[PDB]
Nucleic acid binder design. Structure first.
Ligand SMILES: [Mg+2]
Ligand SMILES: [Mg+2]
Ligand SMILES: [Mg+2]
Ligand SMILES: [Mg+2]
Ligand SMILES: [Mg+2]
Ligand SMILES: [Mg+2]
Ligand SMILES: [Mg+2]
Ligand SMILES: [Mg+2]
Ligand SMILES: [Mg+2]
Ligand SMILES: [Mg+2]
Ligand SMILES: [Mg+2]
Ligand SMILES: [Mg+2]
Ligand SMILES: [Mg+2]
Ligand SMILES: [Mg+2]
Ligand SMILES: [Mg+2]
Ligand SMILES: [Mg+2]
Ligand SMILES: [Mg+2]
Lengths: 95, 236, 76, 45, 117, 243, 50
RNA sequence: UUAAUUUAUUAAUGCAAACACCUGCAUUAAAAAUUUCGGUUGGGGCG
RNA sequence: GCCUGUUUACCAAAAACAUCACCUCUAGCAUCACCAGUAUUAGAGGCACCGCCUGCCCAGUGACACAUGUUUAACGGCC
RNA sequence: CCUCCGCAUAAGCCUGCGUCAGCAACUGACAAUUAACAGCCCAAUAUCUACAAUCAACCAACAAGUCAUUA
RNA sequence: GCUACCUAAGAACAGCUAAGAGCACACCCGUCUAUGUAGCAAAAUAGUGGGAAGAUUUAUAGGUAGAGGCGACAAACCUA
RNA sequence: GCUAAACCUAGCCCCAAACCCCCACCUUACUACCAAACCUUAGCCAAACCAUUUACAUAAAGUAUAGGCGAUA
């Protein structure tokens, strides 16, 4: 996503008033574009005998393209929520 | 604007169709092409450029009979009313095509070549390499979208595995699949090039308005651009 | 080469509102009103048949309900 | 020859300036609204 | 060039003078050859009673007494029309008394008017 | 002269006069609330006060939002809290050059999702930030049932919120028929967002669509006065019979 | 009758009947010479020939 | 226009992003857009 | 100036513009122009029928191709 | 003594030299233009409609053309 | 609704010699002179003229709209 | 002494208070009747040009700030 920043600073409005904007507060300055950040892996739990990304019951770190585009549609992996990690630690105690 | 296109007839028909001139105008009513408008009134003969199509509940190669070779106002090459089985259709005529002529529309690529007559159609694998061809498809079943004007002809330079290479009359080579249909011979109405318009009125009868009088200065585009030949383009 | 351009064929109806994809809810359209409203959903109307018979608005059956339809074609 | 200009016909008057044309576009709808807010007797041809 | 004048049927060209008419009503339809079919049932039949022996003249004599206006409300017409039938059939299915819930099968419907006037 | 009430109150007055006065109060509360969305296109400040470098004195700061334009294609799908930014730039990021206007459009992706509550794969034009919010919410059903109406900012997303909330409210056995255990797994998973069936039907309606819904509720073919007057008369004669 | 919405006729419907006639009539004297078997009226606009 | 400032705009590439199109950021053009055309001077131009 | 034509409604109808003819450039292609066309075609320009002819030049610009080069019926120059 | 005008239709206009009254067609009241001419048309769904016009015949073309059904 | 170009479906072009031919009406235009200059006319009148089967003229409806259209470039015409 | 002069009240303005208003008619409006909406305002002007810029209860306070650090905000 695109994060912009105002060039001209807004005079502050108060506690119960909104800031009224001039045509010079419409002049923005691109401070960051989020798509050009170094991307992050997401944590998952695979539930089958998948490729080298992991085995049954393990929470791992996958690229978002393989994780969103193959694993989560096909039922192979579940999200790394705190709610299912209880069920899979309790699965690991049944071994 | 209220531009509804006249090109709306869904079913193929032998008859002439009343067609509406554009004047060079868009669907938005503004001129996009200059110098169009005001010619003699014309009616459109629907041409079946997909040369090998079978009729209903028939297949294979089939003969056809030329009933009348006819002037066409909508293009430079004259056309032939050609009847076969239970359907008449307008096709575009080759050079020496008379009334009563008979044409083989074929689909079978022979193991040998096919020493074809002047006006029949064959797939490109069924020809001797180096014959004058016209009405060349780009894909199998696409329809003849190439080499269709009067007197033009293309030549089959070489054919390779599943491949023919046509030479267009611009002398650019084309790589087409082996199994698309083309017709042999050159297109009719030859010596359309050696034609004297004679006066500006005969140029206005064709729907061609005069050029503007605004004097343009010639820029770098207007030399004698000797270019090298363009690379051979394929549709495979 | 199909005859008939896109601009002169029957115009495609606009795509259905995404309200209809959700199973649980009944959509709210301008069928409760009796006129178009652009800020409500467009309803799906049942295929309406004129109950009685009228001669100047007769619509013939398609060419199989005609009681003499021979598959073997005659040439007349 | 100049000044003859207005060369009348009722078809071009209704199809150029009439009510149905003024309601065909929202600009002409705002025209009719300026006529009713001004208070005129004839809002259109 | 007029704006103030009412756009009457006398005014346009032939195609405009043909379509627009006065406040008359359609009686039939046009068919091929522009042949007008007049539908018999669309014509209003003036149902006119017999005016023989009828003793109401268009004016009333001045010796008639003056009374008060009591417009027929729904409670009055229910009262004198229905209420003794209810009282006589109560001292011993609302359709028994002249009530019809639906009126699609009715000839002269009250809402909407399918009679005239 | 003047008006009695100011002009920006007038729409709020329209929520008092007629058909809007008969709207249920939990809907009108949900329109009267003015809360801000999550900052999408601007870094929010840390605290309210901020000690500036130029004179070293703490001065209060706010976080003025960026005006975001939402085209109706954003209401066809689920974008994030984001749309086109209509704004202006200075030409070489110094102000003494030409000012010239720019639209920052977001990057769109026609993806596919599976709602386990509504039990359906949707094809949604979506943004990368939306997918990141789905991952941060651990599922699209949690993401739609967690996001506030203002923040989620889609017509189709509030439609999905209304459909999921009616599916959870009624405990509908049309979720997975001939399998009640799986329905109890889903219905226990999203148990936290249980809402009454009265309040769930009004979730995510616009004001005009709610006027249409309220109008279709209380419309009736009117009572003929014969039934009313027969009720009055048999009740009146039952009052006579007790005399 | 005039200034009354007429009920719409479909094929096979009942006869359209007017009971209390709304429009009046007046026969005027002809200002020009006319045949002896001709009476001239002033119909109000919404009244046809039939 | 080879004046100054631009490139919002199109069209090309390039790199990210996404697994060709779209979007972001750069570069190159074409089309343009905004703006201006100092002074003295035995009138002004030239010097 | 080849011709017939066109133009400054309301001060210029011309030698100006157009034009047959000739030449240069761009374009290998379908379903809203071009066009329901396909290089003998279409579009962008120049000059002005036909007849005898159109000489020399890529230094500079611009285009072309990145084989440092090609281009003048391209801008232009020809002691 | 003029007439290169006239009479109609189209388009336009909307009662604007009809009756009565009040340089030397204006106001009030009344009255009229009457359909055969001309507008205002068409039940679907498939399926047909290659051969100009010009006295249409010889001819002669090119700029390739204004006219139709069947189940 | 003028005018520039176009779209649709229409129309007119006598006579004479023999084809964007010639003479020549109707019709279109406006060379040249004169009148007129608050005029009959915010561009006319009288005569002379160029064209008049064609790139003609014209009635009707439709289209293109001002950062534009349109242009056989006059930087014209787009309601004096 | 002709033209004429005069005239006083229709109404209006600024406040306050109070939150207002049968029939035909989107086809050629005034016609009885048949298979789709949202998208920064800009510019004049001031800066003695112009090109970034240029306003749209009280009190703090024209203060902190911003600004071809200048007009000004
Ligand atoms: Mg040319
Ligand atoms: Mg020229
Ligand atoms: Mg005219
Ligand atoms: Mg001096
Ligand atoms: Mg000449
Ligand atoms: Mg002229
Ligand atoms: Mg002039
Ligand atoms: Mg002149
Ligand atoms: Mg010339
Ligand atoms: Mg001639
Ligand atoms: Mg002269
Ligand atoms: Mg002549
Ligand atoms: Mg012209
Ligand atoms: Mg010039
Ligand atoms: Mg000039
Ligand atoms: Mg200034
Ligand atoms: Mg200045």
């Amino acid at each position: 996503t695109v994060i912009v920043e105002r060039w001209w600073k807004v005079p502050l409005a108060g506690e119960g008033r909104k800031p009224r904007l001039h045509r010079r507060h419409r002049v923005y300055k691109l401070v960051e574009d989020t798509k050009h950040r170094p991307k992050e892996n997401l944590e998952l739990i695979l539930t089958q005998s998948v490729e080298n990304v992991g085995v049954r019951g393990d929470l791992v770190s996958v690229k978002k393209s393989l994780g969103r585009n193959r694993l989560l549609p096909q039922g192979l992996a579940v999200y790394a929520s705190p709610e299912n990690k209880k069920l899979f630690e309790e699965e690991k105690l049944l071994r | 604007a209220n531009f509804v296109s006249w090109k709306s007839r869904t079913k193929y028909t032998i008859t002439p169709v009343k067609m509406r001139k554009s004047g060079g105008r868009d669907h938005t009513g503004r001129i996009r092409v200059h110098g169009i408008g005001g010619g003699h009134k014309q009616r459109y003969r629907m041409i079946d450029f997909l040369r090998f199509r079978p009729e209903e509940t028939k297949s294979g190669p089939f003969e056809e009979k030329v009933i009348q070779v006819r002037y066409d106002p909508c293009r430079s090459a004259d056309i032939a009313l050609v009847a076969g089985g239970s359907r008449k259709r307008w096709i575009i005529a080759t050079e020496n095509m008379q009334a009563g002529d008979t044409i083989l529309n074929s689909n079978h690529i022979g193991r040998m070549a096919v020493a074809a007559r002047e006006g029949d159609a064959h797939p490109l694998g069924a020809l001797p390499v180096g014959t004058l061809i016209n009405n060349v498809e780009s894909e199998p079943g696409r329809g003849a979208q190439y080499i269709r004007a009067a007197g033009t002809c293309g030549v089959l330079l070489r054919k390779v595995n599943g491949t023919a290479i046509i030479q267009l009359p611009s002398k650019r080579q084309m790589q087409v699949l082996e199994t698309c249909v083309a017709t042999v011979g050159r297109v009719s109405n030859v010596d359309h090039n050696k034609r004297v318009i004679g006066k500006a009125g005969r140029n206005r009868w064709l729907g061609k308005r005069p050029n503007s009088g605004r004097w343009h200065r010639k820029g770098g585009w207007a030399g004698r651009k000797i270019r090298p030949l363009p690379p051979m383009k394929s549709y495979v | 080469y199909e005859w008939g351009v896109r601009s002169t064929r029957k115009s495609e109806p606009p795509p259905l509102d995404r309200v209809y994809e959700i199973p649980g809810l009944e959509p709210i359209t301008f069928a409760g009103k009796m006129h178009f409203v652009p800020w409500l959903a467009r309803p799906i109307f049942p295929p309406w048949d004129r109950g009685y018979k009228d001669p100047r608005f007769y619509r013939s059956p398609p060419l199989h309900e005609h009681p003499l339809y021979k598959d073997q074609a005659c040439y007349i | 020859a100049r000044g003859n200009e207005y060369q009348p016909s009722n078809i071009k008057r209704k199809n150029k300036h009439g009510w149905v044309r003024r309601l065909s576009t929202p600009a002409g709808v705002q025209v009719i609204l300026r006529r009713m807010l001004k208070g005129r007797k004839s809002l259109s041809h | 060039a007029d704006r103030m004048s009412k756009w009457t049927s006398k005014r346009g060209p032939r195609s405009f003078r043909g379509r627009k008419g006065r406040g008359a009503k359609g009686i039939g339809f046009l068919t091929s050859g522009w042949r007008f079919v007049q539908i018999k049932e669309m014509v209003p039949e003036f149902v006119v009673p017999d005016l023989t022996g009828f003793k109401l003249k268009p004016y009333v004599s001045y010796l008639a007494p003056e009374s008060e206006e009591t417009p027929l409300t729904a409670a009055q017409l229910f009262s004198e029309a229905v209420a003794p039938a209810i009282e006589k059939d109560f001292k011993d299915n609302l359709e028994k008394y002249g009530f019809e819930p639906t009126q699609e099968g009715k000839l002269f419907q009250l809402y909407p008017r399918n009679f005239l006037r | 002269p003047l008006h009695k009430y100011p002009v920006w109150l007038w729409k709020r007055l329209q929520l008092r006069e007629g058909i809007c006065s008969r709207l249920p109060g939990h809907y009108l509360r949900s329109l009267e609330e003015e809360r801000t969305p999550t900052p999408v296109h601007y870094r929010p400040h840390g605290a309210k006060f901020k000690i500036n470098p130029k004179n070293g004195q703490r001065e209060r700061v706010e976080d003025v939002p960026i005006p975001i334009y939402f085209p109706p294609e954003s209401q066809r799908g689920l974008w994030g809290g984001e749309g086109w930014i209509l704004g202006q730039i200075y030409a070489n990021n110094d102000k003494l050059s030409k000012r010239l206007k720019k639209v920052w459009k977001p990057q769109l992706f026609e993806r596919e999702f599976y709602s386990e509550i509504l039990d359906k794969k949707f094809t949604v034009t979506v943004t990368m930030r939306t997918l990141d919010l789905i991952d941060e919410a651990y599922g699209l059903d949690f993401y739609i049932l967690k996001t506030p109406k203002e923040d989620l900012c889609s017509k189709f997303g509030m439609d999905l919120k209304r459909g999921m909330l009616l599916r959870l409210a009624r405990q509908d056995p049309q979720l997975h028929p001939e399998d009640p255990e799986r329905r109890a797994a889903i219905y226990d998973k999203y148990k936290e967002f249980a809402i009454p069936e009265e309040e769930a039907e009004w979730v995510g309606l616009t004001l005009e669509e709610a006027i249409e819904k309220q109008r279709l509720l209380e419309e009736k073919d009117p009572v003929p006065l014969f039934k009313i007057y027969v009720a009055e008369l048999i009740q009146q004669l039952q009052q006579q019979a007790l005399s | 009758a005039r200034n009354v919405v007429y009920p719409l006729y479909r094929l096979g419907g009942p006869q359209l009947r007017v009971f209390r006639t709304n429009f009046f009539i007046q026969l005027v004297r002809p200002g020009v010479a006319q045949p002896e078997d001709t009476v001239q009226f002033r119909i109000p606009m919404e009244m046809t020939r039939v």
